Amino acid sequence: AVKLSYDEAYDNPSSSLLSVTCSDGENGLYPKYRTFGDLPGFPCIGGSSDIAGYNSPNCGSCYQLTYSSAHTTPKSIYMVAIDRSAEGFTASKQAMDDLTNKRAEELGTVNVDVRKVDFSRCE
Ligand SMILES: [Cl-]
Ligand code: NA
Ligand SMILES: [Zn+2]
Ligand SMILES: [Zn+2]
Ligand SMILES: [Zn+2]
C-alpha cells in the first residue's frame, strides 16, 4: 500500500493547470485542460510521487486507489494525477471523503492499494 492524503487546493475547479507540475510541454495538461474543473472526473484529481517533475510521462495518468476501511467494505476512487506529491498520493478533499465515507479530515492520511488503470476509468 501507499499513503493517500488530501489538499483542498484540488477542490477549486477554477485553478489553472499552469499551477501544477503537469502544466504544459509534451506531457502537460495545459492547454488541453485550462482549469482543474475541465479535467475528466473532476474533483477526482491530485498529486502523486510518480510525477517526478515537469513533463513526467505519468502526467494525466489514472490511478485506482482502494481503501479498505476498518468498519466497511472496500471502496475505490479513480484519480487523475496532475501534480507532484513527495510520497504517495494527495487527492482533493471531495475524493478522499468519497473514498473514506466522509472521514478525510478526521483521518488525514490513509493507506490505500494503488493500480494504474486505463484513463477511461477516470472518465
Ligand atoms: Cl504508486
Ligand atoms: Na472541517
Ligand atoms: Zn506508482
Ligand atoms: Zn516514507
Ligand atoms: Zn484504453
CSV table of C-alpha atoms and ligand atoms in Angstrom, one decimal:
chain,number,residue,atom,x,y,z
A,1,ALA,CA,0.0,0.0,0.0
A,2,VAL,CA,0.8,3.7,-0.3
A,3,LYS,CA,-0.3,6.8,1.5
A,4,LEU,CA,-3.2,8.9,0.5
A,5,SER,CA,-3.6,12.5,1.9
A,6,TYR,CA,-5.8,15.4,0.7
A,7,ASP,CA,-5.4,19.0,-0.1
A,8,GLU,CA,-8.3,21.4,-0.7
A,9,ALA,CA,-6.4,23.2,-3.4
A,10,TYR,CA,-7.6,20.3,-5.7
A,11,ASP,CA,-11.2,21.1,-4.9
A,12,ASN,CA,-11.1,24.5,-6.7
A,13,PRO,CA,-12.3,24.0,-10.2
A,14,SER,CA,-11.1,27.4,-11.3
A,15,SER,CA,-7.4,26.8,-10.6
A,16,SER,CA,-5.3,26.8,-13.7
A,17,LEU,CA,-3.4,23.7,-14.9
A,18,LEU,CA,-0.4,26.1,-15.0
A,19,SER,CA,-0.4,25.9,-11.2
A,20,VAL,CA,0.6,22.3,-11.0
A,21,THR,CA,3.6,20.2,-12.1
A,22,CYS,CA,1.8,18.9,-15.2
A,23,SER,CA,1.4,22.3,-16.8
A,24,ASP,CA,2.5,22.4,-20.4
A,25,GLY,CA,5.0,20.6,-22.5
A,26,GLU,CA,4.6,17.3,-24.4
A,27,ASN,CA,3.2,15.5,-21.3
A,28,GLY,CA,1.5,18.6,-19.7
A,29,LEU,CA,-2.3,19.1,-19.5
A,30,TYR,CA,-2.5,22.7,-20.5
A,31,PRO,CA,-3.9,24.0,-22.8
A,32,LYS,CA,-5.9,20.8,-23.5
A,33,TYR,CA,-7.4,21.4,-20.0
A,34,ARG,CA,-7.3,25.0,-18.9
A,35,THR,CA,-8.6,24.6,-15.3
A,36,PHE,CA,-9.0,21.9,-12.8
A,37,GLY,CA,-12.7,21.7,-13.5
A,38,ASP,CA,-12.0,20.8,-17.1
A,39,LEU,CA,-10.3,17.6,-16.0
A,40,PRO,CA,-12.1,14.3,-16.6
A,41,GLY,CA,-13.7,13.1,-13.4
A,42,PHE,CA,-13.0,16.4,-11.5
A,43,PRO,CA,-12.8,16.6,-8.5
A,44,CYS,CA,-11.0,13.2,-8.5
A,45,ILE,CA,-7.6,14.7,-9.3
A,46,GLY,CA,-4.5,15.3,-7.3
A,47,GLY,CA,-0.8,14.7,-6.9
A,48,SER,CA,1.4,11.6,-7.0
A,49,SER,CA,5.0,10.8,-6.3
A,50,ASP,CA,5.0,9.1,-9.7
A,51,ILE,CA,5.1,12.6,-11.1
A,52,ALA,CA,8.8,13.1,-10.8
A,53,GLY,CA,8.7,16.8,-12.0
A,54,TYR,CA,7.9,18.8,-15.1
A,55,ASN,CA,6.9,16.8,-18.2
A,56,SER,CA,6.6,13.5,-16.4
A,57,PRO,CA,5.1,10.7,-18.6
A,58,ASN,CA,2.8,9.9,-15.7
A,59,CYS,CA,1.1,13.3,-16.0
A,60,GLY,CA,-2.6,12.7,-16.8
A,61,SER,CA,-2.5,9.0,-15.7
A,62,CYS,CA,-5.4,7.5,-13.9
A,63,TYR,CA,-4.9,5.7,-10.6
A,64,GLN,CA,-7.3,3.4,-8.9
A,65,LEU,CA,-7.0,3.9,-5.2
A,66,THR,CA,-8.7,1.4,-3.0
A,67,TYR,CA,-9.4,1.9,0.7
A,68,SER,CA,-10.3,-1.0,2.9
A,69,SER,CA,-11.9,0.6,6.0
A,70,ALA,CA,-11.9,-1.0,9.5
A,71,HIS,CA,-15.7,-0.6,9.5
A,72,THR,CA,-17.0,-1.2,6.0
A,73,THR,CA,-16.2,-2.9,2.7
A,74,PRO,CA,-13.8,-1.7,0.1
A,75,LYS,CA,-14.2,1.4,-2.0
A,76,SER,CA,-12.2,2.7,-4.9
A,77,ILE,CA,-11.8,6.1,-6.5
A,78,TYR,CA,-10.1,6.9,-9.8
A,79,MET,CA,-7.7,9.9,-9.7
A,80,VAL,CA,-6.1,11.8,-12.4
A,81,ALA,CA,-2.5,12.7,-11.4
A,82,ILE,CA,-1.6,16.3,-12.4
A,83,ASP,CA,0.9,17.4,-9.7
A,84,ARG,CA,3.9,16.0,-7.8
A,85,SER,CA,3.3,14.8,-4.2
A,86,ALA,CA,6.5,14.0,-2.4
A,87,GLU,CA,5.3,10.5,-1.2
A,88,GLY,CA,2.2,8.6,-2.2
A,89,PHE,CA,-0.8,10.4,-3.4
A,90,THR,CA,-2.7,13.6,-2.4
A,91,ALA,CA,-6.3,14.0,-3.7
A,92,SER,CA,-9.0,16.5,-3.4
A,93,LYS,CA,-10.9,16.5,-0.1
A,94,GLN,CA,-14.0,15.5,-2.0
A,95,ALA,CA,-12.2,12.5,-3.5
A,96,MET,CA,-10.8,11.4,-0.1
A,97,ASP,CA,-14.2,11.9,1.5
A,98,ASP,CA,-15.7,9.8,-1.3
A,99,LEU,CA,-13.2,7.1,-0.6
A,100,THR,CA,-13.4,7.0,3.2
A,101,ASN,CA,-17.1,7.8,3.7
A,102,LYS,CA,-16.7,11.4,4.7
A,103,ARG,CA,-13.7,10.9,7.0
A,104,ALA,CA,-10.9,12.8,5.1
A,105,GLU,CA,-10.3,15.5,7.7
A,106,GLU,CA,-10.6,13.1,10.6
A,107,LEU,CA,-8.1,10.6,9.2
A,108,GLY,CA,-5.8,13.0,7.4
A,109,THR,CA,-3.7,10.2,5.7
A,110,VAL,CA,-4.8,6.6,5.0
A,111,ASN,CA,-3.1,3.6,3.4
A,112,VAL,CA,-4.6,2.5,0.0
A,113,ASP,CA,-3.8,0.0,-2.7
A,114,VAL,CA,-2.9,1.6,-6.0
A,115,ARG,CA,-3.0,0.4,-9.5
A,116,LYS,CA,-2.6,2.5,-12.7
A,117,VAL,CA,-5.7,1.8,-14.8
A,118,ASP,CA,-7.0,2.8,-18.2
A,119,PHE,CA,-7.8,6.5,-18.4
A,120,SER,CA,-11.3,5.6,-19.3
A,121,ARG,CA,-11.8,4.6,-15.6
A,122,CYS,CA,-11.3,8.2,-14.6
A,123,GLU,CA,-13.9,9.4,-17.2
B,1,CL,CL,2.4,4.2,-6.8
B,2,NA,NA,-13.6,20.9,8.7
B,3,ZN,ZN,3.2,4.3,-8.9
B,4,ZN,ZN,8.2,7.0,3.5
B,5,ZN,ZN,-8.0,2.5,-23.1
